[PDB]
Design an enzyme around this catalytic site. Structure first.
Site, PDB file in Angstrom:
ATOM      1  N   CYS A   1       3.765   1.208   9.600  1.00  0.00           N
ATOM      2  CA  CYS A   1       3.596   0.153   8.618  1.00  0.00           C
ATOM      3  C   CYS A   1       4.955  -0.273   8.081  1.00  0.00           C
ATOM      4  O   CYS A   1       5.861   0.558   7.934  1.00  0.00           O
ATOM      5  CB  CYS A   1       2.710   0.583   7.470  1.00  0.00           C
ATOM      6  SG  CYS A   1       0.983   0.600   7.980  1.00  0.00           S
TER       7      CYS A   1
ATOM      8  N   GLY B   1       2.897   5.797  10.305  1.00  0.00           N
ATOM      9  CA  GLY B   1       4.319   5.671   9.980  1.00  0.00           C
ATOM     10  C   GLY B   1       4.946   4.310  10.349  1.00  0.00           C
ATOM     11  O   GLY B   1       6.117   4.065  10.049  1.00  0.00           O
TER      12      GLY B   1
ATOM     13  N   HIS C   1       0.818  -1.203   0.000  1.00  0.00           N
ATOM     14  CA  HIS C   1       0.000   0.000   0.000  1.00  0.00           C
ATOM     15  C   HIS C   1       0.858   1.262   0.000  1.00  0.00           C
ATOM     16  O   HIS C   1       0.322   2.357  -0.073  1.00  0.00           O
ATOM     17  CB  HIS C   1      -1.106  -0.017   1.077  1.00  0.00           C
ATOM     18  CG  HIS C   1      -0.630   0.079   2.482  1.00  0.00           C
ATOM     19  ND1 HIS C   1      -0.671  -1.021   3.298  1.00  0.00           N
ATOM     20  CD2 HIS C   1      -0.112   1.064   3.209  1.00  0.00           C
ATOM     21  CE1 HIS C   1      -0.203  -0.689   4.491  1.00  0.00           C
ATOM     22  NE2 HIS C   1       0.136   0.567   4.466  1.00  0.00           N
TER      23      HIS C   1
END
Ligand SMILES: *[C@](O)(C(N)=O)[C@H](C[C@@H]1CCNC1=O)NC(=O)[C@H](CC1CC1)n1ccnc(NC(=O)OC(C)(C)C)c1=O
Ligand SMILES: *[C@](O)(C(N)=O)[C@H](C[C@@H]1CCNC1=O)NC(=O)[C@H](CC1CC1)n1ccnc(NC(=O)OC(C)(C)C)c1=O
EC number: 3.4.19.12
Lengths: 306, 303
Positions: free
Chosen positions: A145, A143, A41
């Protein structure tokens, strides 16, 4: 002496964390050999997030749209592919700090350490379990991920988790390092909820053994139980079924303490039926279910990693 | 969101841990530049440990009696000296992984990460508070001595603790990296006991703020208390007095949530007087006092 929730030393993983940026979006990646793994993503804008077509979005990217940073060195991207929900970026430089590693998929009840990272920089480490409902009870801000979960065996880092999303009630969901989600979740900004969670019975028993090892013994009673009779009671308190394999797995802690597993089960049965009555075990007022049998042995025997 | 007890990443410290053997004693040392720091009781035999004359024992030792291993590699000891309860072994090789660092003496109520090690090899990481009674609730087995406690600020490692001993009740004591004990403890085999402890009030309030930030807000109430009235109640429960300095320190959390400190204090008073009636806060059934205001800010903002 003492018993603490304890994470693995994080150094081997710190040396693998990079920052990955695609247009406006930045998050963390895992650099091993000449490949960087991150959540797919990273290629979405906020627009796209409601229902992104990732194959389509990736086609439109080129190698140069990926900025990979290892501290203050940019890593040149020379290839890219998607595997399930992870993106693999081939880079022209192999990570000199790559540890011996493997990728594993864990089962519910198993525990692992999380190195929380922001902008490719490690910020903290904590221990989690894969819940029966395939979530983790983590601590993750925007932040994070691409932060990963892992175990160490001797010198070998087993990566089992990469962070993707937050669900209702502030629990977390993510994939293995082949990009397959744990649970029925999807990497899409859409209504999703975890199922009802349950207590990891085998782990509660491991932690009662930990308690006895550390001198807490007040909950030991005079009774034994059948496995059937224990499960009848435990299902009534949203406990996972205890299986013969679990009983077998608890064998070593049983022999160490001289308390038969089904005798510990009878103690737990009473604690569920009667409560703890204001008392504590290993400094907790609730029964703890995020230590595996292995976790207990490891900590009570001082096993080491290099 | 979510709120977890969290240690600092341990890599910078791992790169400093070595094994130190003297005679039949093996424990951990901290290798910074060309000096290895370890507990001086590494030089004792068990019979020495009754009332050891460290100065005289050390005079009898040779640099050769100190076996220092960093992974595979022997580090030749070329010098030794003692500073309070800490032994310093000069070696002929400077640690190339030495991080930017400082030695600090921590205050009661403050927190730090422990890297538990055995045989110079890292075992695990967890967070501890320095208790008001100058103990820590750690997890340490034989071989853990010389394990250190630390904070990391940017790239700078602040070393604050080195492990020496266990006490009855399963708590732990040790020194700063200048070898001075926290609390009245001594490094010899003699019966010792922790004083009565107190609860770190300001830390409990910080954690209640953390709970609110993470959406766990059932214990909030419309009431406020004076500072004096709060202290009258809480001190009955063996909580430290809350000072104006504490109230000030909580100001960022107060501001972030919009809950005044003396409003939150009314929640705490009610939790102490009436308990939780089967509910939990951040998944705990007890009031937690091992998170500082800084720890909560750090974790709820993401440094
Ligand atoms: C990750 O993209 C990153 N850059 O750090 C981020 C991490 C979360 C931010 C807050 N806590 C986190 O764990 N993930 C997301 O933002 C995901 C991206 C989706 C592809 C998976 N994401 C997007 C949109 N919504 C959510 N969650 C959400 O709506 O949460 C509710 C259900 C609790 C309201 C989400 O995780
Ligand atoms: C340390 O020397 C090492 N080699 O690891 C060791 C660490 C402890 C062993 C078990 N868990 C620990 O934290 N320390 C000691 O053994 C100390 C050495 C003294 C110079 C300080 N030590 C010696 C003797 N007794 C104790 N305590 C003790 O027996 O505590 C009881 C009463 C709770 C059993 C002690 O810590």
């Amino acid at each position: 002496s003492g018993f603490r929730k304890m994470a693995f030393p994080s150094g081997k993983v710190e040396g693998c964390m990079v920052q990955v940026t695609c247009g406006t979006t930045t998050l963390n990646g895992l650099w091993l050999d000449d490949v960087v793994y991150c959540p797919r993503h990273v290629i979405c804008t906020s627009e796209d997030m409601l229902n992104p077509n990732y194959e389509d979005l990736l086609i439109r990217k080129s190698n140069h749209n990926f900025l990979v940073q290892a501290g203050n060195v940019q890593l040149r991207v020379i290839g890219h592919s998607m595997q399930n929900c992870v993106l693999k970026l081939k880079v022209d430089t192999a990570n000199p700090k790559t540890p011996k590693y493997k990728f594993v998929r864990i089962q519910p009840g198993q525990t692992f350490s999380v190195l929380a990272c922001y902008n490719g920089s490690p910020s903290g480490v904590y221990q989690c379990a894969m819940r029966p409902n395939f979530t983790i009870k983590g601590s993750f801000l925007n932040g994070s991920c691409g932060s990963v979960g892992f175990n160490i065996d001797y010198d070998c880092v087993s990566f089992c988790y990469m962070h993707h999303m937050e669900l209702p009630t502030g629990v977390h969901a993510g994939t293995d390092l082949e990009g397959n989600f744990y649970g029925p979740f999807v990497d899409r900004q859409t209504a999703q909820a975890a199922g009802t969670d349950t207590t990891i019975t085998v782990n509660v028993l491991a932690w009662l053994y930990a308690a006895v090892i550390n001198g807490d013994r007040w909950f030991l009673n005079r009774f034994t139980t059948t496995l059937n009779d224990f499960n009848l009671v435990a299902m009534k308190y949203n406990y996972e079924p205890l299986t013969q394999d679990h009983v077998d797995i608890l064998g070593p802690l049983s022999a160490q303490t001289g308390i038969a597993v089904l005798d510990m089960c009878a103690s737990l049965k009473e604690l569920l039926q009667n409560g703890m009555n204001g008392r504590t075990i290993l400094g907790s007022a609730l029964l703890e279910d995020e230590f595996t049998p292995f976790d207990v042995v490891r900590q009570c025997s001082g096993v080491t990693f290099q």
